[PDB]
């Protein structure tokens, strides 16, 4: 009803770069800088990867990056490995003092 | 020249600046009951804000005229505040000190 | 405001006359406390007034 939109699955071989899109509306994602990206392995909590479109927390190198243009944002993985197969979730500011998260994207390594 | 009709107490906002030095004006500095107008050569930037996300609600009072009031606060409650740079304000107060010390 | 009080604003409700002058409706508004004065010395602490 109100969740964000993401592609279902993106796949790629090791050594390549993988782009995941996150598309909402003008009031939610196109209004502020507040976009975050989380990575989840099965059987555990999601792991903090990207906050505020392109900034990075501790423990994350330049393997992961982000961008935003208009009503959409994007995660980029450079130098893909076998450990990067996961689910990836996009959360953002959701309008009228709310945050909203969409259905995630399954990354499978070839 | 274009005079800004700025309504403000205890400070003067968006006014004209003196050309070369801070100018201190009074009718007579001996009398205590005269407001001492200090005119700054360089301005100090002040930034003011109300952070809480108010909304506007219209109440129809009588025939065809409305009264606009505050509805809900859509978010969280924060403090309305003004910010002045500390180093520049301390420097400005020291300079107002030296051209006050010219008369004392 | 959402399960917590604000210290500056009161949630004042009052009976407005509508555009039909024999009929009235209840309305509410959030007023700043400098705009609001308690009404009198009567035995009701929940009844207030505008500062005008």
């Amino acid at each position: 009803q109100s969740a964000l939109t993401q592609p279902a699955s993106v796949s790629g071989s090791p050594g390549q770069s993988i782009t995941i899109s996150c598309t909402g509306t003008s009031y939610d994602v196109g209004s502020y800088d507040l976009v975050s990206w989380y990575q989840q392995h099965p059987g555990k909590a999601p792991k903090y990867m990207i906050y505020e479109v392109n900034k990075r927390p501790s423990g994350v190198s330049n393997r992961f990056s982000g961008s935003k243009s208009g009503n959409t944002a994007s995660l980029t993985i450079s130098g893909l490995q076998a450990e990067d197969e996961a689910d990836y979730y996009c959360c953002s500011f959701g309008g009228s003092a709310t945050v909203v998260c969409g259905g995630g994207t399954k990354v499978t390594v070839l | 020249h274009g005079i800004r009709p700025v309504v403000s107490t205890q400070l003067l906002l968006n006014g004209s600046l003196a050309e070369k030095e801070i100018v201190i004006r009074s009718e007579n500095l001996t009398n205590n009951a005269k407001i001492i107008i200090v005119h700054l050569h360089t301005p100090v930037e002040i930034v003011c804000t109300r952070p809480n996300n108010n909304t506007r609600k219209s109440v129809r009072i009588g025939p065809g005229q409305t009264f606009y009031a505050t509805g809900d606060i859509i978010g969280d409650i924060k403090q309305a505040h003004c910010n002045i740079s500390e180093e520049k304000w301390n420097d400005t107060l020291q300079k107002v000190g030296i051209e006050l010390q010219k008369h004392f | 405001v959402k399960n917590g009080t604000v210290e500056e604003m009161k949630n004042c409700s009052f009976n407005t006359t509508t555009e039909i002058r024999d009929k009235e409706k209840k309305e509410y508004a959030l007023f700043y406390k400098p705009d609001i004065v308690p009404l009198s010395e009567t035995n009701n602490t929940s009844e207030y007034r505008l500062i005008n």
Partner: nanobody
Framework: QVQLVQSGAEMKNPGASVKVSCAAS????????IHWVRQAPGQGLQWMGW????????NTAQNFQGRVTMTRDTSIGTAYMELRSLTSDDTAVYYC????????????????????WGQGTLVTVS
């Protein structure tokens, strides 16, 4: 160092109400917002609400506004969240996470900066 401990798994009948707990450590439970999120089994994340643990102000999404209640105890540093009128949709894994920085000058509530996460509680409705 900073880690969030939740309660155990629960199973209830439909029409009941559940209380998920969340114990804080390291950051003394204040000075950070706390966000409650939900994940159905095999589905994506769903955000339910936030709590300002310093002053008790809580907010939640437009779908959940009648059914969720967030409270806290600041002496031991623990958060409680009640969900009411349980249905067969509501069986899910529930997560407690940190948020923005409580600052008294700018609204840091809607910042989706979930630093540390709990282990999640499975709430089963049958």
């Amino acid at each position: 160092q900073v880690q969030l401990v939740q309660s155990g798994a629960e199973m209830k009948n439909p029409g009941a109400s559940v209380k998920v707990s969340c114990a804080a450590s390291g950051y003394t439970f204040t000075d950070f917002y706390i966000h409650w999120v939900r994940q159905a089994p095999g589905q994506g994340l769903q955000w339910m609400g936030w709590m300002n643990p310093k002053t008790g102000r809580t907010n939640t999404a437009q779908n959940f506004q009648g059914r969720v209640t967030m409270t806290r105890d600041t002496s031991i540093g623990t958060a409680y969240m009640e969900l009411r009128s349980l249905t067969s949709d509501d069986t899910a894994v529930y997560y407690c996470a940190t948020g923005g920085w409580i600052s008294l000058y700018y609204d840091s509530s809607y910042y989706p900066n979930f630093d540390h996460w709990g282990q999640g509680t499975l709430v089963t409705v049958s």
